[PDB]
Ligand binder design. Sequence first.
Ligand SMILES: O=C(O)/C=C/c1ccc(NC(=O)C2(NC(=O)c3ccc4c(C5CCCCC5)c5n(c4c3)CC(=O)Nc3ccccc3-5)CCCC2)cc1
Length: 551
Amino acid sequence: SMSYTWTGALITPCVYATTSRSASLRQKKVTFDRLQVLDDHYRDVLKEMKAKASTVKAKLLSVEEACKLTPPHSARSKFGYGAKDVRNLSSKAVNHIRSVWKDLLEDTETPIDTTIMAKNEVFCVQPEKGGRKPARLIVFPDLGVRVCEKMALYDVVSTLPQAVMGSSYGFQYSPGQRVEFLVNAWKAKKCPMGFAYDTRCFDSTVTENDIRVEESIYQCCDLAPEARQAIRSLTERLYIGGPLTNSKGQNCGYRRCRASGVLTTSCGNTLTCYLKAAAACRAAKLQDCTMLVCGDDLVVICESAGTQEDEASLRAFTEAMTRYSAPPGDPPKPEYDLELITSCSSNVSVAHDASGKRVYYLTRDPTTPLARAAWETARHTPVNSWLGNIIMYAPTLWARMILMTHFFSILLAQEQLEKALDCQIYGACYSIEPLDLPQIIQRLHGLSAFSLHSYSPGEINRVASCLRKLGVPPLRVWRHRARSVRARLLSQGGRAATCGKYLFNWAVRTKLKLTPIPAASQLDLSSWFVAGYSGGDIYHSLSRARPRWFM
Ligand SMILES: O=C(O)/C=C/c1ccc(NC(=O)C2(NC(=O)c3ccc4c(C5CCCCC5)c5n(c4c3)CC(=O)Nc3ccccc3-5)CCCC2)cc1
């Protein structure tokens, strides 16, 4: 079948930002027929995955529990209620949610309607590597269907990927734990070889069989009878496909591939990518494979068979993935240094802590983080990528010296340090106060994240070149700015002084001891690095369990 079918009605509207004006360029790329051929390797891996899914017991969420997972700014329903009414358990919201649920139990076939829209993402204007990127399209069902998805599948998509893929499931790892996994896997090989595999329009390559095989994995869970029917009905009416409706309410066509804005997008993509890749590893006869999968993002670490043999096994891996309908964008290349593998646009780098000890950490090219941060300072935005980047890339030179200094200077000026802000972590939305950042960083990266030095020449040059390219003042200006920022924060006491002392210890001439923050342990981070939820429409507010009067 065709991944998509179009009527001709436009995808109407809701350093550059991507708009609906480029949607036509994306539509051309994502529209094609899929030719999938399965084999014994695929069926074997699938049976192995299902045997692991069999150990899972999933709970049906109540209306109230599902309502609480709804983001405050989640797209309103076309049936006269919004995200605020859902969160407050309003009579109209709850009634419509209960009628949608009943309809999923009684109707097993009628396709559910979805909205199609162009995503507005900020990217850096690079004329050296061609031109602008067309907008990525987002396909999502109505708010009421989105609440029912959580009731039926929130526990499944949170528990199942880990039970099935084990250590291969990328979203169970904080950036440091991801780093620890890769270092340990690389060290485990006599002669290691690693590669990243990028699929061209992964969502489009997802066939209805891929989606039915994904349900066969869900059906291995211990499920409540109504959860079982809702999964069956949601697969048939929503997940395999359905009609597309633009922002103006006009028919845009149809979809027969993965919808990017459903709860099962991350889980489904991860299970599908793992299945195809694990099977392809066998077809290519790659020895002692270790995989790390995050949706469509795959990294394979294996035992090298020699330079020529490694290139031949990669073409074989690619031939198998292509048969499974997962062809590459850019063909994969073998790497023989862990630092050379770029996965989720990130790479491993090393530094030293205060005592000269080596510390591995995850970094990335800072152009997009800085360009998006510049856009976010220029105009008000719903989600703050700057906050998510400080959290995830806390040990990096660029997040410490530029993102922290810049945003703490703004927060000091606006007197908004205590004001909670929304950020994205593995697709889920988190409401976080900037004052909690020292504690969040200590928990995810360790106390060493505040003492790191001896950055590599390559990492330093990438940062310095990026600042020049973007017209950002040099690193010496940032150290000078951080000293004033730090001084002002220190004078305020409490969590504000903790921000000063810990986040900006790199800026002082002499450098302080830095003892662990005692209130860091109180932070409830139980739901943080469990699963991926991109497109899932998931929200969580940061909570502090058992506070002490003096902390
Ligand atoms: O050689 C020396 O001894 C000193 C050199 C030197 C050079 C430039 C300055 N610049 C400044 O003071 C001003 N801008 C900045 O002090 C500035 C701060 C952050 C900037 C950012 C981002 C960085 C990440 C957080 C969000 C802001 C960008 N740009 C920035 C400029 C340059 C800019 O204007 N825009 C962009 C566009 C895309 C990406 C980044 C930027 C403020 C008043 C005049 C311009 C200061 C000192």
